[PDB]
Design a protein around this ligand. Structure first.
Ligand code: NA
Lengths: 171, 170
């Protein structure tokens, strides 16, 4: 099914290089700017969004009124929430780089995260726009055999669970 | 949906020609070498693996950290575990080659095997790499109208449940 996944606009921790999961931070001015640029660039399909503020706000600025689902949240980094990527222990770094065997204390494992994300996608009964996070987009892109790195406020359309259709970036 | 079926590397019973099911044998040195060679070939899709040592070790050396599922185990041969294929009683060997029905003493029936395997496959929610055994790979290939012979340490990619995409025999 055609799904459009949108990575929310930037927050302060994006420029600061800190892990941002369930910590509810707001979009920055540029983050809201990135979000407004999405209006008119996305199809008028039913919309779903992480309930986290930065996602909800991106959806709103993009001209949508999404139904909220915590299932679309970024992975829960547990004790690693807010940690600087730079000083992250090499084992955690490579776990995240290779996207496997990641189990932060007090948090969610990558395997649990993937099950949550794919279970949500499996339940969609028609094309939709999903306002979510970098990790969710990455999980989907990697499952489709592609690099999952996409700029904040950008989008990707896929034919789940078969292939990527288009990557949309706006300047 | 893209599935990669990987047959774990060789054990002593592979080269000895013995039925290997739930007997938890380790990989030989060559078996580990075969596993390492897969690292530069297999796509980085979510990974799952039989919980048996030889499959787990293959996944590890191939550069993966799989979720463990006993449903991916080879069939349980029961009293036939370790039995030489060459001297296998014609009544067992026939059953196995007819693919119509099979239930070794103290073992698992082919119907239970298949229930187990296909339940797992049908439950997958996204593309994946599956570290498993010859019988499982066989079962999948046959379900797609193909011949289920892949060397140890090799893989086959399929568009489940439609057709085979490519075979990777190293
Ligand atoms: Na035996």
């Amino acid at each position: 099914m055609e799904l459009w996944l949108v990575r929310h606009g930037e927050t302060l921790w994006n420029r600061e290089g800190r892990l941002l999961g369930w910590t509810d931070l707001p979009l920055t001015a540029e983050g809201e700017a990135q979000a407004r640029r999405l209006k008119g660039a996305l199809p008028s399909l039913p919309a779903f969004s992480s309930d986290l503020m930065r996602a909800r706000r991106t959806a709103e600025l993009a001209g949508f009124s999404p139904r909220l689902y915590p299932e679309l949240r970024e992975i829960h980094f547990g004790a690693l929430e807010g940690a600087l990527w730079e000083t992250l222990d090499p084992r955690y770094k490579e776990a995240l780089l290779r996207f496997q065997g990641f189990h932060p204390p007090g948090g969610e494992s990558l395997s649990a995260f993937q099950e949550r994300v794919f279970r949500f996608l499996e339940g969609l009964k028609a094309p939709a726009v999903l306002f979510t996070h970098g990790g969710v987009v990455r999980a989907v892109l990697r499952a489709l055999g592609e690099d999952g790195l996409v700029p904040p406020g950008s989008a990707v359309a896929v034919d789940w669970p078969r292939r990527v259709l288009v990557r949309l970036a706006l300047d």
